[model samples]
Target: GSSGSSGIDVGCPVKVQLRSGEEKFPGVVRFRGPLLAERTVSGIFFGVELLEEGRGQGFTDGVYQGKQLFQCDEDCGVFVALDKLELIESGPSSG
Candidate 1:
């Protein structure tokens, strides 16, 4: 499968900071894809498991609406849309 144009994928460390929101999350992408919602239906979302500093600040534990998108501790997961994620270039994407 093609990794999206945002260049994010599972296992990549990224920075998620919503526009107009002061909160910032340091996390790694555990899941990345679009899911059904009560509202707008397309556009891929990034599912991340936060670092130690960001744990418990989120609203999910990698599970949403009975779908376990990824595995993480309680309140350590955050899911946001494409525009909210800013990748951290601290690591190589190379294998």
Candidate 2:
């Protein structure tokens, strides 16, 4: 979730609990936004590249504002509310 004052850095490891009574899904952080044009729901949303082969459950790609934020199979990435996610770990600190 992007509730923090600042957005989580791109490539950060994260897990999101998409539904109650289900295991949190692992993913890589891609984009954090106040709003994305294609999204109808308001508030900050973050794009995540699913670790498992989600087979594009509810997505076509993890693109936003014409930028390919993260790569995954078609429909494998998703935009989720910040409140539904939790940071698992930070990515590499340097290039």
Candidate 3:
């Protein structure tokens, strides 16, 4: 295996395999590092989300801005790994 390097540097833009419609698309590398006891990876990528329930152009750029309400030492390696995205719903509270 090769030594650690900037994921953005060594990573490549890949076309993912899909079912139908836009069957292929491009993604980028955010970061790579050891997770748990083994070497793991995480990448902050971007793509189109066309679901009527979840519609938007989200970005997975792993930089942890102060807006995040959790504890993170560094930019948590990468962000949403291309296809892996967590979309949380938030509504105004009646306070």
Q: Rate the local accuracy (lDDT) of all candidates.
A: 0.76, 0.65, 0.32
* Residue range with the least summed lDDT across 10 consecutive positions in model 1: 1-10
Rank candidates, lDDT, best first: 1, 2, 3
Instruction: Flag regions of model 3 displaced more than 4 Å.
Output: 1-9, 16-22, 33-56, 64-95
Q: What RMSD value applies to candidate 3?
A: 15.2
Give Cα distance to truth, residue 93, candidate 1, Å.
17
Colliding residue pairs in candidate 3: 44-79
Q: In candidate 1, how many Å is residue 72 off?
A: 0.3
lDDT tens digits, residue span 1-95, model 2? 34656445567666766668476677777776655455676667777777763334536276666766666666667777777666764545747
Q: What clash count goes with each model?
A: 0, 4, 1
My TM-score estimates for the predictions, one after another, are 0.75, 0.59, 0.24
RMSDs, each prediction? 4.9, 6.2, 15.2
Query: How far is 82's C-alpha from truth in model 3 (Å)?
Result: 9.3
Candidate 1: where are CA atoms >4 Å away? 1-6, 91-95
